[PDB]
Amino acid sequence: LVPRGSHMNTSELRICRINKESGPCTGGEELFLLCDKVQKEDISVVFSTASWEGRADFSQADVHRQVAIVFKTPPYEDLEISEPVTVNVFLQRLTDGVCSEPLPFTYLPR
Amino acid sequence: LVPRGSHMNTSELRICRINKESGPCTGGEELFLLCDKVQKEDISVVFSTASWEGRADFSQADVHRQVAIVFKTPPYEDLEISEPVTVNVFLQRLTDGVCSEPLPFTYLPR
């Protein structure tokens, strides 16, 4: 349960991989990741950086057989980035607020 | 079980989506798709066109919890294509040789 920021990391939540490594900072894009056993009714996908945090948008429906999650990327804090900004994506249980190890995801401009 | 080529289609195998819509005709690229309940020990991923058929490369291991499959794309018949050639990707049970509905995937040159 060892600490990793304001929240807590676990070996219970794990993100195997995302289909798209990058994407535009506008957000809204529809992506989908693989993971281990997750509780469809208690799970979220969060994008973050030291000072910004964005949640993906998806329904319990979008969670396929507890190991995949189709979601819609949140827009990046600033939509006027001029550079490729790669942040952190990771899972997190609502209940115990526990998170998973992050995966790098990079926003791009238009 | 209605016919669709030399083989047979079913409502038992379904490909929800692939992470990458395209890729180079060289093949070898590592992709992964979503699908419904598949038998890890009886399933394959085939790329085809009316006159060419290629199989993806993956192990029973690469099949995650029966709904996702991480595989390696086969090279396209001709690696000297000058144009974007989009073929068909689909599942198929070894035993009953039954297939699924195809999904378009397009090879590209270098």
mmCIF file of C-alpha atoms in Angstrom:
data_model
loop_
_atom_site.group_PDB
_atom_site.id
_atom_site.type_symbol
_atom_site.label_atom_id
_atom_site.label_comp_id
_atom_site.label_asym_id
_atom_site.label_seq_id
_atom_site.Cartn_x
_atom_site.Cartn_y
_atom_site.Cartn_z
ATOM 1 C CA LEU A 1 0.000 0.000 0.000
ATOM 2 C CA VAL A 2 3.180 2.150 -0.011
ATOM 3 C CA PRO A 3 2.698 5.949 -0.743
ATOM 4 C CA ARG A 4 3.058 7.662 -4.142
ATOM 5 C CA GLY A 5 1.763 11.222 -3.920
ATOM 6 C CA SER A 6 -1.266 12.471 -2.010
ATOM 7 C CA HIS A 7 -2.896 9.079 -2.735
ATOM 8 C CA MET A 8 -1.796 5.433 -2.452
ATOM 9 C CA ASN A 9 -0.402 2.812 -4.894
ATOM 10 C CA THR A 10 -1.243 -0.915 -5.031
ATOM 11 C CA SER A 11 -0.356 -4.239 -6.639
ATOM 12 C CA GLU A 12 -4.106 -4.849 -6.946
ATOM 13 C CA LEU A 13 -4.614 -2.430 -9.856
ATOM 14 C CA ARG A 14 -2.442 -2.722 -12.944
ATOM 15 C CA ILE A 15 -2.591 -1.080 -16.354
ATOM 16 C CA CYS A 16 -1.265 -3.446 -19.011
ATOM 17 C CA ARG A 17 -1.384 -0.962 -21.901
ATOM 18 C CA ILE A 18 -3.256 1.688 -23.852
ATOM 19 C CA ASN A 19 -4.129 1.512 -27.526
ATOM 20 C CA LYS A 20 -2.851 5.003 -28.257
ATOM 21 C CA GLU A 21 0.396 6.256 -26.781
ATOM 22 C CA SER A 22 -0.433 9.891 -27.590
ATOM 23 C CA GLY A 23 -3.224 12.216 -28.685
ATOM 24 C CA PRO A 24 -4.250 15.883 -29.003
ATOM 25 C CA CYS A 25 -4.439 18.069 -25.904
ATOM 26 C CA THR A 26 -8.014 18.977 -26.874
ATOM 27 C CA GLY A 27 -9.116 15.730 -25.321
ATOM 28 C CA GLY A 28 -12.404 14.084 -26.146
ATOM 29 C CA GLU A 29 -10.600 11.348 -28.081
ATOM 30 C CA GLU A 30 -11.894 7.801 -27.549
ATOM 31 C CA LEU A 31 -9.228 5.435 -26.240
ATOM 32 C CA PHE A 32 -9.241 2.100 -24.445
ATOM 33 C CA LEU A 33 -6.815 0.334 -22.135
ATOM 34 C CA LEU A 34 -6.144 -3.175 -20.815
ATOM 35 C CA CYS A 35 -5.839 -4.006 -17.136
ATOM 36 C CA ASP A 36 -6.285 -6.696 -14.525
ATOM 37 C CA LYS A 37 -9.407 -7.447 -12.504
ATOM 38 C CA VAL A 38 -11.258 -4.176 -11.812
ATOM 39 C CA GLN A 39 -14.653 -3.589 -10.180
ATOM 40 C CA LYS A 40 -16.761 -1.970 -12.890
ATOM 41 C CA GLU A 41 -18.756 -0.066 -10.267
ATOM 42 C CA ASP A 42 -15.646 1.184 -8.449
ATOM 43 C CA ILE A 43 -12.961 2.395 -10.814
ATOM 44 C CA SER A 44 -11.753 5.439 -12.687
ATOM 45 C CA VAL A 45 -9.071 6.479 -15.126
ATOM 46 C CA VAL A 46 -7.074 9.568 -14.212
ATOM 47 C CA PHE A 47 -4.598 11.648 -16.124
ATOM 48 C CA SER A 48 -2.232 13.686 -14.028
ATOM 49 C CA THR A 49 0.954 15.644 -13.641
ATOM 50 C CA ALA A 50 2.333 17.021 -10.410
ATOM 51 C CA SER A 51 -0.107 19.916 -10.487
ATOM 52 C CA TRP A 52 -2.996 18.853 -12.728
ATOM 53 C CA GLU A 53 -5.440 16.000 -12.700
ATOM 54 C CA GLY A 54 -8.029 15.043 -15.277
ATOM 55 C CA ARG A 55 -10.523 12.169 -15.290
ATOM 56 C CA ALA A 56 -11.521 10.212 -18.370
ATOM 57 C CA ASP A 57 -15.189 9.903 -19.248
ATOM 58 C CA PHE A 58 -16.849 6.477 -19.420
ATOM 59 C CA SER A 59 -19.782 4.460 -18.054
ATOM 60 C CA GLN A 60 -19.911 1.122 -16.260
ATOM 61 C CA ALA A 61 -20.975 -0.113 -19.678
ATOM 62 C CA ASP A 62 -17.703 0.975 -21.277
ATOM 63 C CA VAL A 63 -15.911 -1.424 -18.877
ATOM 64 C CA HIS A 64 -15.547 -4.683 -20.736
ATOM 65 C CA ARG A 65 -15.489 -7.978 -18.800
ATOM 66 C CA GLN A 66 -13.450 -6.336 -16.010
ATOM 67 C CA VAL A 67 -10.145 -6.209 -17.896
ATOM 68 C CA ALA A 68 -10.573 -3.465 -20.496
ATOM 69 C CA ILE A 69 -11.928 0.044 -20.359
ATOM 70 C CA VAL A 70 -13.048 2.141 -23.284
ATOM 71 C CA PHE A 71 -12.964 5.791 -22.270
ATOM 72 C CA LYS A 72 -12.788 9.359 -23.555
ATOM 73 C CA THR A 73 -9.659 11.397 -22.825
ATOM 74 C CA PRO A 74 -10.011 14.579 -20.756
ATOM 75 C CA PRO A 75 -8.638 17.788 -22.203
ATOM 76 C CA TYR A 76 -5.299 18.977 -20.941
ATOM 77 C CA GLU A 77 -5.153 21.900 -18.485
ATOM 78 C CA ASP A 78 -3.845 24.217 -21.175
ATOM 79 C CA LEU A 79 -5.071 23.636 -24.717
ATOM 80 C CA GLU A 80 -2.465 26.032 -26.037
ATOM 81 C CA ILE A 81 0.563 23.839 -25.474
ATOM 82 C CA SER A 82 3.201 24.305 -28.145
ATOM 83 C CA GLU A 83 5.157 21.277 -26.995
ATOM 84 C CA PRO A 84 4.433 17.554 -26.613
ATOM 85 C CA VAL A 85 3.437 17.154 -22.971
ATOM 86 C CA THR A 86 3.392 13.581 -21.702
ATOM 87 C CA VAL A 87 1.539 12.992 -18.453
ATOM 88 C CA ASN A 88 0.530 10.036 -16.291
ATOM 89 C CA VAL A 89 -2.457 7.789 -16.728
ATOM 90 C CA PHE A 90 -3.512 5.313 -14.079
ATOM 91 C CA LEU A 91 -6.412 3.493 -12.432
ATOM 92 C CA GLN A 92 -7.986 4.253 -9.104
ATOM 93 C CA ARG A 93 -10.689 2.702 -6.956
ATOM 94 C CA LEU A 94 -13.293 5.135 -5.747
ATOM 95 C CA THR A 95 -13.944 3.377 -2.405
ATOM 96 C CA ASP A 96 -10.431 2.946 -0.999
ATOM 97 C CA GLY A 97 -9.077 5.647 -3.311
ATOM 98 C CA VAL A 98 -6.155 3.340 -4.062
ATOM 99 C CA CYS A 99 -4.377 3.846 -7.386
ATOM 100 C CA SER A 100 -2.219 1.834 -9.722
ATOM 101 C CA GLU A 101 1.152 2.392 -11.255
ATOM 102 C CA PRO A 102 1.051 5.084 -13.916
ATOM 103 C CA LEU A 103 1.666 4.811 -17.642
ATOM 104 C CA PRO A 104 3.003 7.714 -19.716
ATOM 105 C CA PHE A 105 0.592 9.368 -22.133
ATOM 106 C CA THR A 106 1.450 12.419 -24.163
ATOM 107 C CA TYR A 107 -0.789 15.260 -25.289
ATOM 108 C CA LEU A 108 -0.070 17.090 -28.547
ATOM 109 C CA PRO A 109 -1.189 20.433 -30.046
ATOM 110 C CA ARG A 110 -3.324 20.895 -33.178
ATOM 111 C CA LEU B 1 -23.765 -20.122 -39.495
ATOM 112 C CA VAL B 2 -24.499 -18.482 -42.887
ATOM 113 C CA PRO B 3 -21.610 -18.551 -45.504
ATOM 114 C CA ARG B 4 -19.067 -15.767 -46.142
ATOM 115 C CA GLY B 5 -16.306 -17.056 -48.403
ATOM 116 C CA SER B 6 -14.683 -20.483 -48.357
ATOM 117 C CA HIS B 7 -15.256 -20.504 -44.568
ATOM 118 C CA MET B 8 -18.209 -19.729 -42.274
ATOM 119 C CA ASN B 9 -19.329 -16.684 -40.212
ATOM 120 C CA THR B 10 -20.896 -16.688 -36.726
ATOM 121 C CA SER B 11 -22.542 -14.540 -34.061
ATOM 122 C CA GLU B 12 -20.392 -16.409 -31.528
ATOM 123 C CA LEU B 13 -17.153 -14.596 -32.418
ATOM 124 C CA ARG B 14 -17.070 -10.810 -32.467
ATOM 125 C CA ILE B 15 -14.245 -8.306 -32.780
ATOM 126 C CA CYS B 16 -15.063 -5.152 -30.830
ATOM 127 C CA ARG B 17 -12.039 -3.136 -31.981
ATOM 128 C CA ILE B 18 -8.312 -2.912 -32.611
ATOM 129 C CA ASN B 19 -5.952 -0.434 -31.004
ATOM 130 C CA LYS B 20 -4.343 0.549 -34.290
ATOM 131 C CA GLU B 21 -6.415 1.117 -37.401
ATOM 132 C CA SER B 22 -3.364 0.925 -39.683
ATOM 133 C CA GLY B 23 0.303 -0.044 -39.804
ATOM 134 C CA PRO B 24 3.240 -0.751 -42.145
ATOM 135 C CA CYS B 25 3.011 -3.583 -44.663
ATOM 136 C CA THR B 26 6.279 -4.967 -43.267
ATOM 137 C CA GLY B 27 4.273 -6.536 -40.496
ATOM 138 C CA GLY B 28 5.802 -7.614 -37.224
ATOM 139 C CA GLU B 29 4.095 -4.729 -35.424
ATOM 140 C CA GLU B 30 2.566 -5.555 -32.029
ATOM 141 C CA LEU B 31 -1.157 -4.827 -31.867
ATOM 142 C CA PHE B 32 -4.022 -5.950 -29.659
ATOM 143 C CA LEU B 33 -7.769 -6.231 -30.132
ATOM 144 C CA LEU B 34 -10.914 -6.556 -28.009
ATOM 145 C CA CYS B 35 -13.506 -9.268 -28.508
ATOM 146 C CA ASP B 36 -16.151 -11.367 -26.819
ATOM 147 C CA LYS B 37 -15.689 -14.737 -25.139
ATOM 148 C CA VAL B 38 -12.993 -16.699 -27.007
ATOM 149 C CA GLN B 39 -11.381 -20.048 -26.159
ATOM 150 C CA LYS B 40 -7.710 -19.245 -25.623
ATOM 151 C CA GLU B 41 -6.724 -22.714 -26.841
ATOM 152 C CA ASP B 42 -8.891 -22.502 -29.973
ATOM 153 C CA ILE B 43 -8.633 -19.152 -31.701
ATOM 154 C CA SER B 44 -6.644 -17.243 -34.276
ATOM 155 C CA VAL B 45 -6.445 -13.819 -35.845
ATOM 156 C CA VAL B 46 -6.375 -13.708 -39.633
ATOM 157 C CA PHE B 47 -5.718 -10.933 -42.080
ATOM 158 C CA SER B 48 -7.107 -11.457 -45.535
ATOM 159 C CA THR B 49 -8.163 -10.115 -48.884
ATOM 160 C CA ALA B 50 -9.911 -12.062 -51.603
ATOM 161 C CA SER B 51 -6.664 -13.708 -52.648
ATOM 162 C CA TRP B 52 -4.306 -13.469 -49.668
ATOM 163 C CA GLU B 53 -4.450 -14.624 -46.096
ATOM 164 C CA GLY B 54 -2.044 -13.950 -43.265
ATOM 165 C CA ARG B 55 -2.146 -15.100 -39.639
ATOM 166 C CA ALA B 56 -1.053 -12.995 -36.692
ATOM 167 C CA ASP B 57 1.518 -14.385 -34.289
ATOM 168 C CA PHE B 58 0.656 -14.867 -30.608
ATOM 169 C CA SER B 59 0.606 -17.472 -27.824
ATOM 170 C CA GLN B 60 -2.188 -18.662 -25.553
ATOM 171 C CA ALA B 61 -0.458 -16.395 -23.062
ATOM 172 C CA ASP B 62 -1.037 -13.311 -25.208
ATOM 173 C CA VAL B 63 -4.802 -13.969 -24.863
ATOM 174 C CA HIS B 64 -5.953 -11.929 -21.910
ATOM 175 C CA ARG B 65 -8.913 -13.130 -19.810
ATOM 176 C CA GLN B 66 -10.689 -14.364 -22.966
ATOM 177 C CA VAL B 67 -11.697 -10.934 -24.274
ATOM 178 C CA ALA B 68 -8.480 -9.357 -25.553
ATOM 179 C CA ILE B 69 -5.666 -10.606 -27.720
ATOM 180 C CA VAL B 70 -2.223 -9.103 -28.026
ATOM 181 C CA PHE B 71 -0.685 -10.240 -31.298
ATOM 182 C CA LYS B 72 1.947 -9.457 -33.919
ATOM 183 C CA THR B 73 0.794 -8.434 -37.397
ATOM 184 C CA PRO B 74 1.783 -10.629 -40.353
ATOM 185 C CA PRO B 75 3.543 -8.984 -43.264
ATOM 186 C CA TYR B 76 1.488 -8.184 -46.312
ATOM 187 C CA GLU B 77 1.814 -10.376 -49.424
ATOM 188 C CA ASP B 78 3.744 -7.675 -51.239
ATOM 189 C CA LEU B 79 6.020 -5.467 -49.158
ATOM 190 C CA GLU B 80 6.471 -3.128 -52.090
ATOM 191 C CA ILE B 81 3.011 -1.604 -52.052
ATOM 192 C CA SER B 82 3.025 2.039 -53.070
ATOM 193 C CA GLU B 83 -0.556 2.549 -51.959
ATOM 194 C CA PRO B 84 -2.465 2.194 -48.680
ATOM 195 C CA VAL B 85 -3.974 -1.288 -48.836
ATOM 196 C CA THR B 86 -6.682 -1.981 -46.275
ATOM 197 C CA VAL B 87 -7.560 -5.622 -45.726
ATOM 198 C CA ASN B 88 -9.774 -7.659 -43.405
ATOM 199 C CA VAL B 89 -8.983 -8.816 -39.912
ATOM 200 C CA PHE B 90 -11.142 -11.320 -38.089
ATOM 201 C CA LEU B 91 -11.246 -14.152 -35.559
ATOM 202 C CA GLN B 92 -11.556 -17.831 -36.266
ATOM 203 C CA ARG B 93 -11.887 -20.980 -34.193
ATOM 204 C CA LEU B 94 -9.476 -23.714 -35.133
ATOM 205 C CA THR B 95 -11.833 -26.615 -34.291
ATOM 206 C CA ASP B 96 -15.013 -25.668 -36.161
ATOM 207 C CA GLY B 97 -13.084 -23.285 -38.414
ATOM 208 C CA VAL B 98 -15.860 -20.750 -37.868
ATOM 209 C CA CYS B 99 -14.944 -17.082 -38.291
ATOM 210 C CA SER B 100 -16.243 -13.740 -37.150
ATOM 211 C CA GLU B 101 -17.228 -10.600 -38.937
ATOM 212 C CA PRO B 102 -14.213 -8.779 -40.328
ATOM 213 C CA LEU B 103 -12.814 -5.384 -39.406
ATOM 214 C CA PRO B 104 -10.882 -3.223 -41.878
ATOM 215 C CA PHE B 105 -7.153 -2.837 -41.294
ATOM 216 C CA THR B 106 -4.860 -1.004 -43.648
ATOM 217 C CA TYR B 107 -1.223 -1.679 -44.467
ATOM 218 C CA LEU B 108 1.090 1.187 -45.425
ATOM 219 C CA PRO B 109 4.512 1.413 -47.130
ATOM 220 C CA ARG B 110 7.749 2.657 -45.531
#
